[PDB]
Design a protein around this ligand. Structure first.
Ligand SMILES: Cn1cnc2c(O)nc(N)nc21
Ligand SMILES: [Zn+2]
Ligand SMILES: [Zn+2]
Lengths: 189, 182
């Protein structure tokens, strides 16, 4: 607690980070990220997941999910975990460091203003999102104040941006979380 | 780094100690003076020239302290603010610093936050942010604040986080300059 910043990973996320995995097509990468969303929701976390891949080979470097409530840490969004775990594994703060393959972050949702800045500092060269900011806000979450034309912001820093990839499935998982997110017991959740 | 079951960012000894030693600093300038000591300690421990600490806003009881651990920590998210807010939340056992019955918390920072930390401050539940060095001062030694929204301060204030800036600005700048020179 008090000698380190320590956010524990639920087993399914340990498993995801331990098992070698190559997913070539963007839809394959996002399909896998959306499996983590569903698993995270069943392990007490928020409806968001993200993974860092080698952009050109499809090799999964590290995955993260939203652990804000179970990990008691408002910074524990999926993207922060995924980026930080990828950095720890490749032993550098800078995923663009000399000698590293170009890295891509694939995220179940467009980033909040915090994760937006994290993406910029991280060194990934591309960002691929499923759910749009409006989908996320629809179930009550807040993206916070991003700068005007944040996507342009990214591209002007050499970070390519794609969004809407498997958005339908991503929206369906947001709604499942929402519909199970009350206090009144509903066997079915 | 080592462990595959956690995101684990180790803190250097002065910062472990800052996090486990009792300190009550009533005046704003006393809080900021303490954060500036951390800045200089962190530089000597191979970190960036930034520190922050979360205090109880009224009493000035220090809850937790963070510094920039990006390079030695291998973690671009390890800015001073992210560590200080996260360690405070850990110690108070909640992801939300304005959870009912917790005292109002305040983030005292050696410089204005970058766009990432600006987001982190919004989600954290702190009700006050107090900065030393300005954005300009920070760019003037080659750190990037990133594309923050126009009127980031009004953004915080509209969400119930009061903002004070420039507090011991000159002292904090002298440490920025020293960092940049060495
Ligand atoms: C809005 N929001 C809250 N938590 C989030 C997370 O972990 N990822 C993304 N993309 N958005 C989030
Ligand atoms: Zn986020
Ligand atoms: Zn920052």
């Amino acid at each position: 607690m008090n000698d380190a910043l320590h956010i524990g990973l639920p087993p399914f996320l340990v498993q995801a980070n331990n098992e070698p995995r190559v997913l070539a097509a963007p839809e394959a990468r996002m399909g896998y990220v959306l499996e983590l969303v569903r698993a995270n929701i069943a392990a007490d976390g928020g409806p968001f997941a993200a993974a860092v891949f080698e952009r050109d080979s499809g090799l999964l470097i590290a995955a993260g999910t939203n652990r804000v409530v179970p990990g008691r840490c408002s910074a524990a969004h999926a993207e922060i975990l995924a980026l930080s775990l990828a950095q720890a594994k490749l032993d550098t703060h800078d995923l663009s460091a000399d000698g590293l393959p170009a890295c891509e972050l694939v995220t179940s949702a467009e980033p909040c203003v915090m994760c937006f800045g994290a993406v910029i500092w991280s060194g990934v060269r591309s960002l691929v999102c499923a759910a749009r900011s409006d989908d996320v806000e629809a179930i009550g979450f807040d993206e916070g104040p991003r700068p005007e034309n944040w996507m342009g912001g990214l591209e002007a820093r050499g970070i390519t941006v794609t969004t809407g990839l498997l958005r339908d499935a991503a929206c369906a998982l947001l709604r499942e979380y929402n519909a199970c997110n009350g206090v009144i017991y509903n066997a079915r959740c």
